[PDB]
């Protein structure tokens, strides 16, 4: 939809702090910190796919809005995830071990803006079309 495309990361703020707040170790935060992934969003029928592609690691999720799914994250958490569309924003929550984190994806002008929150840490990542 408004989201469908191939997106390339152009800016990131507070991502190391976000990863730290989630308990991610040094080696994975080192891989994530200066990675500039592509995010490939597609839709077919009920099913949305989001691929995150980067030199040292690729991940993918496919889901139906409102339907919880199991996800293995890039930092190897086993989480339960639910994604909904609220006011044009794709809102993802991941739940594990009594914890939660949100990843919100929105379109603003030419940007795909991704806000990641864990506790008191807010990270913002900005993608532009490839
Ligand atoms: O911008 C995005 O799509 C988002 C995320 C993302 O790109 N994460 C990447 S790309 C990447 C790596 C990680 C990574 N994340 C984590 C923890 C934070 C979750 N540990 O490693 C590690 C291996 C190299 C490539 C995560 C938050 O949701 C939005």
Swiss-Prot record:
GO molecular function: fatty acid binding; hormone receptor binding; long-chain fatty acid binding; long-chain fatty acid transmembrane transporter activity
Record protein name field: Fatty acid-binding protein, adipocyte
CDD domains, sorted: FABP4
GO biological process: brown fat cell differentiation; cellular response to lithium ion; cellular response to tumor necrosis factor; cholesterol homeostasis; fatty acid transport; long-chain fatty acid transport; negative regulation of DNA-templated transcription; positive regulation of cold-induced thermogenesis
Chain residues that bind a fatty acid: 125-127
Residues that bear Phosphoserine: 11
Gene3D superfamilies (alphabetical): 2.40.128.20
Gene it is expressed from: FABP4
UniProt xrefs under SUPFAM superfamilies: Lipocalins (SSF50814)
Subunit structure: Monomer. Homodimer. Interacts with PPARG.
Signal peptide: none
Function: Lipid transport protein in adipocytes. Binds both long chain fatty acids and retinoic acid. Delivers long-chain fatty acids and retinoic acid to their cognate receptors in the nucleus.
Domain comment (free text): Forms a beta-barrel structure that accommodates hydrophobic ligands in its interior.
Compartment(s) where it occurs, according to its Swiss-Prot or TrEMBL record: Cytoplasm; Nucleus
Keyword line: Acetylation, Cytoplasm, Lipid-binding, Nucleus, Phosphoprotein, Transport
Entry-linked PROSITE patterns: FABP
Motif (Nuclear localization signal): 20-30
Any matching Pfam family: Lipocalin
InterPro entries in the cross-refs: Calycin (IPR012674), Fatty_acid-bd (IPR000463), ILBP (IPR031259), Lipocln_cytosolic_FA-bd_dom (IPR000566)
Modified residues (Phosphotyrosine): 18
Principal location: cytoplasm
Family classification: Belongs to the calycin superfamily. Fatty-acid binding protein (FABP) family.
GO terms for cellular component: cytoplasm; cytosol; extracellular exosome; lipid droplet; nucleus
């Amino acid at each position: 939809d408004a989201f469908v495309g191939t997106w390339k990361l152009v800016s990131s703020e507070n991502f190391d702090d976000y990863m730290k707040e989630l308990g991610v170790g040094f080696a994975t935060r080192k891989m994530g910190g200066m990675a500039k992934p592509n995010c490939i969003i597609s839709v077919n029928g009920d099913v949305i796919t989001i691929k995150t592609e980067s030199t040292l690691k690729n991940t993918e999720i496919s889901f139906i809005l409102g339907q919880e799914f199991d996800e293995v994250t890039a930092d190897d958490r086993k989480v339960k995830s639910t994604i909904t569309l609220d006011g044009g924003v794709l809102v993802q929550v991941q739940k594990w071990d009594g914890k939660s984190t949100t990843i919100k994806r929105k379109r603003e002008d030419d940007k795909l803006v991704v806000e990641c929150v864990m506790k008191g840490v807010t990270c913002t990542r900005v993608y532009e079309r490839a």
